[PDB]
Every structure is written in C-alpha cells, then in structure tokens.
Enzyme design. Structure first.
Site, mmCIF file in Angstrom:
data_model
loop_
_atom_site.group_PDB
_atom_site.id
_atom_site.type_symbol
_atom_site.label_atom_id
_atom_site.label_comp_id
_atom_site.label_asym_id
_atom_site.label_seq_id
_atom_site.Cartn_x
_atom_site.Cartn_y
_atom_site.Cartn_z
ATOM 1 C CG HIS A 12 -2.027 -1.009 0.914
ATOM 2 N ND1 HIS A 12 -2.860 -1.285 0.650
ATOM 3 C CD2 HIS A 12 -1.881 -2.247 2.210
ATOM 4 C CE1 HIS A 12 -3.243 -2.550 0.434
ATOM 5 N NE2 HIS A 12 -3.301 -3.136 1.803
ATOM 6 C CE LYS A 41 -5.130 -6.434 -1.924
ATOM 7 N NZ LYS A 41 -4.002 -6.349 -0.844
ATOM 8 C CG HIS A 119 -6.816 -4.247 6.931
ATOM 9 N ND1 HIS A 119 -6.566 -4.716 6.079
ATOM 10 C CD2 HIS A 119 -7.215 -3.536 7.317
ATOM 11 C CE1 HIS A 119 -7.863 -4.679 5.634
ATOM 12 N NE2 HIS A 119 -8.543 -3.649 6.825
ATOM 13 C CG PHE A 120 -5.717 0.754 2.465
ATOM 14 C CD1 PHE A 120 -7.067 1.015 2.062
ATOM 15 C CD2 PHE A 120 -4.969 2.213 2.632
ATOM 16 C CE1 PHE A 120 -8.171 1.951 1.896
ATOM 17 C CE2 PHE A 120 -5.888 3.450 2.359
ATOM 18 C CZ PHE A 120 -6.787 2.932 1.633
ATOM 19 C CG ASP A 121 -10.931 -1.275 7.200
ATOM 20 O OD1 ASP A 121 -10.986 -2.394 7.615
ATOM 21 O OD2 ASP A 121 -12.223 -0.573 7.909
#
Length: 124
Positions: A12, A41, A119-121
C-alpha cells in the site's frame, strides 16, 4: 517471514510518486509489489505519502473497522491515493486493473509496538 508492517508497506505505500502518472500504474505496481503472484488480488489501494505521515494515522481518529474491530484509525487529512480494481479482461496470470487517482481520507488498522498500520481498510 515478512512482517505485517513490511507487508503493509509492500502492498500500500508508494512514497516515490505523488500520484499515478498513467492508466498503467496499477498494472505495473500490482505486478512489481508481487500482489498477483498467486492470484489476481481484486482491489488494492496505494498511498502516495511519506511513511511517517501514514504511520501518524495510528494516532488520529479511532473508528471501527469495516469488520467491527476497534483498532482502526481515520486520517485527519486527505491523502493522495490510487485505487486499483481488476478489470473484466483480467485473467490470471495476466492480471489487469483499472487505475483511479484521488485525494481521500484513509482508514487503517494498527498493531504492535511501534504501533503501525498493518491493514488498509477503506478511504472516505
């Protein structure tokens, strides 16, 4: 093995560019960061900011993650991001993506000590 923090940088972070320079950004980045190794992905977001600015989100507005978890944080300011979404012609191993560039707030989940994004939410 690769740490969650490292993995987050790998999936990211793009501090090397201020924005996507062309429609091919996603296709190239998805491949180079190894996000298409095992499978395509489906979606991915790259953040065009310094590591420090993104790590700082962990100390901004606490919000619930999409799955309910409570270790998510929303950025006080908008950030330059690129969203990558698989296209209808995408077919492993030839993963293909649509590139969309924007300025939005990011939501990340943080963990550990130092407490950093893992984590990217979502972007808002």
């Amino acid at each position: 093995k690769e740490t969650a923090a490292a993995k987050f940088e790998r999936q990211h972070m793009d501090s090397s560019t201020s924005a996507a320079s062309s429609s091919n950004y996603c296709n190239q980045m998805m491949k180079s960061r190894n996000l298409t190794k095992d499978r395509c992905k489906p979606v991915n977001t790259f953040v065009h900011e310094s590591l420090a600015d993104v790590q700082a989100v962990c100390s901004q507005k606490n919000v619930a993650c999409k799955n309910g978890q409570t270790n998510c944080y929303q950025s006080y300011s908008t950030m330059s991001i690129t969203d990558c979404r698989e296209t209808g012609s995408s077919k492993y191993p030839n993963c293909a993506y649509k590139t969309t560039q924007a300025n939005k707030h990011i939501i990340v989940a943080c963990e550990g000590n130092p407490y950093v994004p893992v984590h990217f939410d979502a972007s808002v």
